[PDB]
Amino acid sequence: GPGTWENMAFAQDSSAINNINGYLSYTGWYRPYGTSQDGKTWYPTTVADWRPILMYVWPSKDVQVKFIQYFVNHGYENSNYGLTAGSVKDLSENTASINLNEVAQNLRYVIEQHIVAAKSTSQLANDINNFITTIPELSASSELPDESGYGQVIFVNNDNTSYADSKYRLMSRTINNQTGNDNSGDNGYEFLTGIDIDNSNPVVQAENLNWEYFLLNYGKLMGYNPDGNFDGFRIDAADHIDADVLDQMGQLMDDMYHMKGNPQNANNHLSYNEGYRSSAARMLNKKGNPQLYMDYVGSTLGNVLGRANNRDTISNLITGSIVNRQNDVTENEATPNWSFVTNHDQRANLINGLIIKDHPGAYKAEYANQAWQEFYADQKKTDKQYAQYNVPAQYAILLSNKDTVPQIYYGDLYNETAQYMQEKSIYYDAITTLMKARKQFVSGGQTMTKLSDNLIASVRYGKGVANANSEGTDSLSRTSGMAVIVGNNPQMAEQTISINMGRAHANEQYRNLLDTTDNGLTYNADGAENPETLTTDDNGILKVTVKGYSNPYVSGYLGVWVPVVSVNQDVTTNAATVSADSNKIFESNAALDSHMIYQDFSLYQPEPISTENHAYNIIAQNAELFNNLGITDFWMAPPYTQYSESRYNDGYSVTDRYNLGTNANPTKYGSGEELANAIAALHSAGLKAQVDIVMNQMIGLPGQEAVTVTRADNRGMQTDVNGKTYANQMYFAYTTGGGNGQETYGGKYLSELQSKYPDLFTTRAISTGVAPDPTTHITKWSAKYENGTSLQNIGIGLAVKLPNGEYAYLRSSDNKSFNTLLPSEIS
Numbered sequence: 001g002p003g004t005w006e007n008m009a010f011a012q013d014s015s016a017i018n019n020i021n022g023y024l025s026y027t028g029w030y031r032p033y034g035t036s037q038d039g040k041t042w043y044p045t046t047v048a049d050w051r052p053i054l055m056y057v058w059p060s061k062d063v064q065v066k067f068i069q070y071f072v073n074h075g076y077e078n079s080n081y082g083l084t085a086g087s088v089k090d091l092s093e094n095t096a097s098i099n100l101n102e103v104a105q106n107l108r109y110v111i112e113q114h115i116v117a118a119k120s121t122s123q124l125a126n127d128i129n130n131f132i133t134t135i136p137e138l139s140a141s142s143e144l145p146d147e148s149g150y151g152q153v154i155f156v157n158n159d160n161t162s163y164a165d166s167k168y169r170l171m172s173r174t175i176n177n178q179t180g181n182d183n184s185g186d187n188g189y190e191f192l193t194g195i196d197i198d199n200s201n202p203v204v205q206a207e208n209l210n211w212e213y214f215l216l217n218y219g220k221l222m223g224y225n226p227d228g229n230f231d232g233f234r235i236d237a238a239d240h241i242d243a244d245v246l247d248q249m250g251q252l253m254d255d256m257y258h259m260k261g262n263p264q265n266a267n268n269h270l271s272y273n274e275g276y277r278s279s280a281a282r283m284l285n286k287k288g289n290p291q292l293y294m295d296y297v298g299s300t301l302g303n304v305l306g307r308a309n310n311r312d313t314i315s316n317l318i319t320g321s322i323v324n325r326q327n328d329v330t331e332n333e334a335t336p337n338w339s340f341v342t343n344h345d346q347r348a349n350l351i352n353g354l355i356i357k358d359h360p361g362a363y364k365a366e367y368a369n370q371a372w373q374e375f376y377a378d379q380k381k382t383d384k385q386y387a388q389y390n391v392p393a394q395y396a397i398l399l400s401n402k403d404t405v406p407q408i409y410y411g412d413l414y415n416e417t418a419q420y421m422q423e424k425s426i427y428y429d430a431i432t433t434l435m436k437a438r439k440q441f442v443s444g445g446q447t448m449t450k451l452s453d454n455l456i457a458s459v460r461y462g463k464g465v466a467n468a469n470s471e472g473t474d475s476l477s478r479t480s481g482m483a484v485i486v487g488n489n490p491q492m493a494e495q496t497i498s499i500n501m502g503r504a505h506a507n508e509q510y511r512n513l514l515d516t517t518d519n520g521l522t523y524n525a526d527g528a529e530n531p532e533t534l535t536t537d538d539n540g541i542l543k544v545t546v547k548g549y550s551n552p553y554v555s556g557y558l559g560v561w562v563p564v565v566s567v568n569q570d571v572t573t574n575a576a577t578v579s580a581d582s583n584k585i586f587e588s589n590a591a592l593d594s595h596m597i598y599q600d601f602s603l604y605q606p607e608p609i610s611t612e613n614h615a616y617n618i619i620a621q622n623a624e625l626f627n628n629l630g631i632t633d634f635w636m637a638p639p640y641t642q643y644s645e646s647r648y649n650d651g652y653s654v655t656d657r658y659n660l661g662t663n664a665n666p667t668k669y670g671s672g673e674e675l676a677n678a679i680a681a682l683h684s685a686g687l688k689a690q691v692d693i694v695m696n697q698m699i700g701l702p703g704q705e706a707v708t709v710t711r712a713d714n715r716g717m718q719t720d721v722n723g724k725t726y727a728n729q730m731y732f733a734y735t736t737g738g739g740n741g742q743e744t745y746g747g748k749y750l751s752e753l754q755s756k757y758p759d760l761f762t763t764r765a766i767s768t769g770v771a772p773d774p775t776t777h778i779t780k781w782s783a784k785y786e787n788g789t790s791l792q793n794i795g796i797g798l799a800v801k802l803p804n805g806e807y808a809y810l811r812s813s814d815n816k817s818f819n820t821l822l823p824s825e826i827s
């Protein structure tokens with residue numbers, strides 16, 4: 001006949017029981033053989049009838065007790081089955097098992113009543129979820145977030161999860177710790193956020209070369225616009241990945257384009273690494289500079305000019321950089337670098353920040369519209385609280401600085417939350433003015449002289465003018481060069497200053513390119529304290545009148561001077577095709593200094609309302625504008641397909657490294673067809689395009705996997721979150737995925753790469769001593785290619801452990817290791 005034996009699983013395989021690599025979860029569901037509402041009648045289940053494992057099986061009697069009470073006190077009481085707040089109140093872990101199981105069974109009869117009554121298992125599912133949050137052990141809090149709600153676990157080897165084992169996982173082998181011989185030092189840590197990819201794994205390192213080759217040939221390989229090919233890379237999280245891959249990328253690029261001897265070929269394939277750590281400069285220098293180093297002078301800029309209060313003194317613009325500009329009168333000596341006033345991450349750090357001020361760390365609903373209104377309202381004020389002061393002055397410094405490839409932020413030229421390029425920012429005129437002036441005037445040596453604690457003169461001596469005493473070698477010498485005068489004190493007394501324009505600019509006239517007034521900036525001298533033109537004396541000294549002002553554009557002083565000319569000039573230096581040093585890839589000099597990068601996106605860029613609004617399409621339409629502005633090198637957003645639930649849908653939350661969008665499923669930026677065209681439009685204007693390559697993480701991978709984990713700090717060593725920790729734990733992490741793109745293109749070009757450039761696969765990597773391995777292709781990511789994950793908000797108590805200490809297990813398809821062990825209550 002019938003009975004409670006019907007609580008067994010219908011069958012002990014995946015078809016009737018949820019599992020992940022054979023293991024069961026307390027959030028899992030299974031198909032009993034039958035259920036009952038009263039005790040007497042038992043209905044054989046259909047394959048559509050599933051119930052939560054937490055109705056039948058518990059981690060401990062304590063939790064079994066709390067499951068019964070919480071359900072009774074949330075509408076599953078029924079006195080006719082001895083279930084009232086009163087009848088369950090006194091139950092405890094020391095209550096008899098035989099008794100507790102009688103109660104849980106009787107609760108199970110009422111649950112079945114609710115299911116029929118409400119015609120679904122939905123309120124039940126919702127109740128289970130809520131119950132789990134009350135149990136510290138099963139809750140997401142058991143994975144031990146740190147004080148700021150962050151943290152990560154590492155994937156370690158384990159006899160239960162041996163399919164996820166790795167011989168590699170060499171963590172924090174970054175920068176100057178590639179060999180693992182200075183773990184304690186200035187190296188930059190392994191973990192940032194998301195599922196961390198193991199870039200020490202020879203197969204992964206081979207997959208990166210594949211990926212890079214796909215992107216350097218994107219349009220050709222995809223049969224889109226065949227000139228729609230990236231020329232180089234912008235390297236995300238370069239301080240946070242085994243530095244082997246920065247070596248390897250540079251090797252591939254030198255193999256493909258012959259960059260080492262040829263400054264022309266190098267400079268046509270610019271690469272730049274994100275990461276200001278001074279140690280990175282050191283590292284890149286020792287290596288012959290395969291990529292540009294990311295300088296910190298933008299932080300100096302914000303601290304000296306951008307703050308409302310607490311403004312670091314003016315002389316920090318001279319020394320507050322990987323390059324000292326006291327008197328920089330030499331070439332090929334500075335660390336080849338890229339610098340900026342702003343990037344995507346600085347805006348975010350401000351916008352988040354406004355988000356927690358306005359709304360007390362609460363339900364993070366989308367009142368990022370409110371944070372943005374506040375930003376835009378503050379951006380226009382003279383007395384700003386949040387936004388940056390002196391934005392034009394900062395770009396004046398950035399754009400006149402020798403030995404750097406400067407980087408403009410889309411967001412500083414355009415209102416980044418409006419549709420792409422639909423709204424210019426109030427700073428567009430100023431910045432673009434200075435950008436054009438750079439092309440025409442900014443070359444030669446540099447001298448930054450202090451004149452007070454608040455006032456500086458940054459002079460460039462002009463093309464082919466090495467220093468203050470030089471005569472002039474080029475025929476643009478006389479009519480090029482610039483003086484940038486910046487005061488960071490808005491109450492600075494009016495006064496007269498002297499500026500040495502060099503011995504090659506005696507009795508020369510100077511245009512007042514840009515000057516400060518009561519209201520802002522004037523481009524023709526109207527409203528300022530200086531005339532449209534001034535002249536130098538015999539020794540090349542310029543008298544200028546300066547004063548403190550306070551308006552939305554300037555808090556202090558900004559003035560800029562350039563030679564009078566009747567013509568357009570362009571002071572770029574072509575790279576000659578024979579490097580002063582054949583050990584170098586990149587060299588800091590006039591040729592490299594003639595480059596300028598544009599960051600073409602913001603995280604808060606909105607979803608396009610239509611195809612006409614795809615950033616890719618609008619870029620293709622405005623390529624000549626970018627060229628006019630003096631931009632040579634385009635940094636394009638990570639173009640990869642994203643996690644559906646990502647906050648900003650921005651490119652950094654990667655589910656498919658090869659799907660750059662299709663016509664019906666574009667990214668925020670557009671389709672791959674449209675990307676390839678956008679790239680080709682830029683090429684058509686003589687620009688180059690670099691892609692943002694994200695080797696560090698993947699996010700929103702839909703496949704769960706039973707892995708074994710240790711709560712670890714961000715370098716990869718275990719850590720204690722205030723007393724507590726845990727190691728060698730079963731965790732049901734999202735680790736597996738990649739999409740058709742990883743399946744279709746994974747490892748596909750390694751044959752071609754090997755035949756064309758064998759050295760890639762015989763050169764031994766520093767961190768491993770072993771060459772990249774092209775003999776396995778990665779067509780799907782999983783835990784075995786991953787160091788770990790940022791805390792996934794799941795919990796560490798989900799894996800069902802039998803009373804005897806062993807994890808519950810099921811022999812299934814992939815699952816074919818040990819013997820099937822199921823709880824007493826489900827078999």
Ligand SMILES: C[C@H]1O[C@H](O[C@H]2[C@H](O)[C@@H](O)[C@@H](O[C@H]3[C@H](O)[C@@H](O)[C@H](O)O[C@@H]3CO)O[C@@H]2CO)[C@H](O)[C@@H](O)[C@@H]1N[C@H]1C=C(CO)[C@@H](O)[C@H](O)[C@H]1O
Nearest residue numbers: 188192193236237238239274275276277345646650652653
């Ligand atoms: C991972 C997250 O941030 C990434 O940018 C990182 C830098 O790559 C990282 O080095 C770090 O900053 C500095 C580093 O601490 C230091 O050692 C070195 O001297 O200089 C580094 C350069 O700044 O922190 C920033 C972030 O603040 C990438 O931009 C993204 O991968 C990612 N950004 C976002 C995106 C998403 C998803 O769309 C979020 O999930 C993520 O939380 C968020 O930060």
Ligand SMILES: C[C@H]1O[C@H](O[C@H]2[C@H](O)[C@@H](O)[C@@H](O[C@H]3[C@H](O)[C@@H](O)[C@H](O)O[C@@H]3CO)O[C@@H]2CO)[C@H](O)[C@@H](O)[C@@H]1N[C@H]1C=C(CO)[C@@H](O)[C@H](O)[C@H]1O
Nearest residue numbers: 607608609610611642643644645649665666667668669670
């Ligand atoms: C519907 C409309 O919206 C489109 O914008 C898209 C993005 O291009 C796309 O990335 C997609 O992004 C992710 C989204 O944030 C996330 O919530 C979801 O779960 O996953 C998506 C991909 O991972 O969604 C945004 C919008 O949220 C384009 O701008 C439009 O072309 C697109 N077309 C629609 C609407 C119109 C407009 O009239 C029709 O003409 C068109 O036929 C229709 O397909």
Ligand code: NA
Nearest residue numbers: 190191240241
């Ligand atoms: Na990493």
